[PDB]
Amino acid sequence: LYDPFMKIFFIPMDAFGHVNACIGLARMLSEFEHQCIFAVPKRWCKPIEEYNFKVEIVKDPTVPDDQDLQKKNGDFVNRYSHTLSKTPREQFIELLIPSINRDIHYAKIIDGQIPTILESIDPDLIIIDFYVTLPSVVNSGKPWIHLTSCNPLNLYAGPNVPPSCFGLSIDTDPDTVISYKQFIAESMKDVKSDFDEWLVSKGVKPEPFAISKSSPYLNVYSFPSDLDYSEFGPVPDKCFRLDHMVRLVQEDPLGFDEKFFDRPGKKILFSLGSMGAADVELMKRLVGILGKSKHLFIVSKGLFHDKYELPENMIGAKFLNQMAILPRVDLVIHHGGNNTFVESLYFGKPSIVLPLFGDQHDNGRRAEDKKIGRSFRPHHVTEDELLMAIDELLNDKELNNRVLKIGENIRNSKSIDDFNKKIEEIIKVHK
Ligand SMILES: O=c1ccn([C@@H]2O[C@H](COP(=O)(O)OP(=O)(O)O)[C@@H](O)[C@H]2O)c(=O)[nH]1
Ligand SMILES: OC[C@H]1O[C@@H](O)[C@H](O)[C@@H](O)[C@@H]1O
Ligand SMILES: OC[C@H]1O[C@@H](O)[C@H](O)[C@@H](O)[C@@H]1O
């Protein structure tokens, strides 16, 4: 009252992989003194408030106000556990379509609430991390940025480029690319038809193939320069690469006594993400193999942690302080989740990738193609392949030096500075 900031409105899908990439970008933008506000359901309000971001609650009467954060996706993964071992084409129909039906339900539920919040907050910029189009954002008249927190293969979508979600070779011939595009379009025809009718009901022009509209302003993604798909040309039109969106801040308990770190031996973080460990039978299988390893494991045990025991070379908990753990381990065993994958590299750690579904398969392929890890299907991987791959990566000086240099390049990237200049040029013209 007696004395170039902006108000930034973040709309993430209600899951860790979207929320944690938005918190990571918000932390980076708050260093420039921007005010970041989050539109999230009630169960996510106090957890996001612990990072000193303002929260605008959106109603979702299909999920209780006080539900555990891991129950929604955990229950879903348990309900579809039989699909996790199937080929990527069986998964697309039996799992990814059921999964995107829940994204579409949530989009419809929140979309009608966003216009009132936009009128009240009057943000300068909207940032959305969603897998489907939001009409309230398209129609807001405000500049908006689409945030890609998953592997970025989908952004390269174009003639002769393999579609995402199948772990396809970057060498895939145009005949195979079309075969997969036709499989996707036939598989999605009913879901897309219903979703396009909803877009039309709100005055938005559907996409021919996609059900996620690109921002006409800017599209920001999280992927290391050293890993990016330069095989398919430069950074795509109206896209912007950040090497990472690692929050760094994590105010959650460690999950276990820190005295485990005093135990002598190589340390391995074994996390299948925020929902992968909900396949109890897979976790009991992988824990039985790793119990034969001479190394020490910290395990992200997930929603059903009370249904299974870890052997004595291991410690774990339902949910861990992964920001606290990563710098203190030697190797990560993960599912190829794009946050976990990039967090592992930020800290300069090699990885064993066990993809469950979707974009994980593309990070499985990428770990092998860029020689920064080893990839296997978790349900079929043999005892010998998994234990020998752990020793191989721990003792491979050339691959460890490779991932250390990638870690340094990620941590020392100044791309957020160029991002900040772009969003300022966009806000100046559009209000
Ligand atoms: O024990 C855990 C398990 C997960 N995470 C975080 O939850 C997010 C999971 O997202 P990701 O894309 O890695 O996998 P998803 O859970 O989305 O499949 C990541 O940011 C992890 O850092 C964590 O902090 N502690
Ligand atoms: O939850 C949405 C998605 O987040 C992404 O960052 C991960 O790659 C996927 O494992 C996950 O399905
Ligand atoms: O490729 C874009 C996204 O499509 C979704 O249907 C999948 O569940 C995600 O894993 C993927 O990242």
- Cα(192)–Cα(101) distance, integer angstroms: 10
* Ligand positioned closest to the Cα atom of 47: 1
- Cα(271)–Cα(306) distance, integer angstroms: 16
Q: After which residues is the chain broken (C to N over 2.5 A)?
A: 3
Q: Tell me the three state secondary structure of residue 380.
A: coil
Tell me, in angstroms, the distance from the centre of ligand 2 to residue 148's CA. Answer: 10
Query: Is 99's C-beta closer than 6 angstroms to any atom of ligand 3?
Result: yes
Technique that determined the structure = X-ray
| Closest C-alpha to 39, from 129, 132, 146, 140 | 129
Q: Is 320 annotated as belonging to a binding site?
A: yes
| Closest C-alpha to 403, from 347, 324, 332, 354 | 347
Assigned token pair, 32: 């420039």
Assigned token pair, 71: 């129950």
- Cα(329)–Cα(151) distance, integer angstroms: 24
Element holding 148 (H helix, E strand) = strand 144-148
- Cα(25)–Cα(246) distance, integer angstroms: 8
- Cα(411)–Cα(407) distance, integer angstroms: 6
- Cα(278)–Cα(359) distance, integer angstroms: 18
Per domain, the residue ranges of the chain are 7-239+414-429, 258-411
Tell me, in angstroms, the distance from the centre of ligand 3 to residue 298's CA. Answer: 28
Assigned token pair, 106: 């949530």
Q: Quick check: do 7-239+414-429 and 258-411 share a fold?
A: yes
Q: How far apart are the first and last CA of the chain?
A: 23
Atom of ligand 1 nearest to the CA of 149: 12
Atom of ligand 2 nearest to the CA of 17: 4
Half-sphere exposure of 268 (CA within 13 A, CB side): 26
Q: Is 343 annotated as belonging to a binding site?
A: yes
Contact in structure between 182 and 202 (CB atoms under 8 Å):
no
* Ligand positioned closest to the Cα atom of 187: 3
- What would be the CATH architecture of the domain defined by 258-411? 3-Layer(aba) Sandwich (3.40)
User: Count of CB atoms within 10 A of residue 279's CB?
Assistant: 26
User: Count of CB atoms within 10 A of residue 260's CB?
Assistant: 16
Assigned token pair, 151: 């592997």
Q: Is 340 annotated as belonging to a binding site?
A: yes
Contact in structure between 279 and 304 (CB atoms under 8 Å):
no
- Cα(85)–Cα(147) distance, integer angstroms: 29
- Give CATH superfamily name and number for 7-239+414-429: Glycogen Phosphorylase B; (3.40.50.2000)
Q: Which amino acid is at 260?
A: F
- Cα(78)–Cα(69) distance, integer angstroms: 15
Atom of ligand 3 nearest to the CA of 360: 10
Q: Which amino acid is at 353?
A: V
Contact in structure between 145 and 90 (CB atoms under 8 Å):
no
Residues in CB range of 201: below 8 A, 6 or more apart? none
Element holding 195 (H helix, E strand) = helix 174-201
- Cα(89)–Cα(166) distance, integer angstroms: 7
Q: Is 20 annotated as belonging to a binding site?
A: yes
- Pick from 93, 102, 147, 150 the residue to mutate for probing ligand 3's pocket: most ligand atoms within 8 Å of its CB: 150
